[PDB]
Every structure is written in C-alpha cells, then in structure tokens.
Amino acid sequence: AKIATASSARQTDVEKPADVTFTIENV
Amino acid sequence: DDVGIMQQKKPPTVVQSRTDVFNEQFANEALHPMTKVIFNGLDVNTEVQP
C-alpha cells in the first residue's frame, strides 16, 4: 500500500499419537 | 522488468571530503555497499511538467 515489504513462512508439521478405535474392519 | 511504483530502500547516501586539507585515516566506513556524495545537499530539479 505504501512501502514494499518482505515476509517469511515455514511449512508446519502436525502429528498426534495413534488413537484407539473400537470398530472392526474386515470379517 | 518493469518500473516500480512503491518506494524502494537506500543505504543511504552520506557526505565526506570537501576542503583543501583532509588528513583522512580510512577507519570504519561501511563494508556494506553504500553511497558517498561530494557536494552537500544537491538534488536540484523542482520543475514538474504536466
């Protein structure tokens, strides 16, 4: 708008411990 | 490859040696790329042509 600037970014990393599920898959 | 609209960035310029006796020492200055003008307060061109 007034002065030309410069910004920076860094790709984030998201992970949780493997959760527990009660539903079964195959026969 | 195009003419910029928003203002840019400067070193900026600074004045130094003028008189008939200097005796400089070369200490300090900027290793970083800078600019040095001889005459003090130049930039004279006030006429605008619409």
TrEMBL record, chain A:
Lineage per the UniProt record: Viruses, Riboviria, Orthornavirae, Duplornaviricota, Resentoviricetes
Q: Under what name is this protein listed? A: VP1
Q: Which organism is it from?
A: Bombyx mori cytoplasmic polyhedrosis virus (BmCPV)
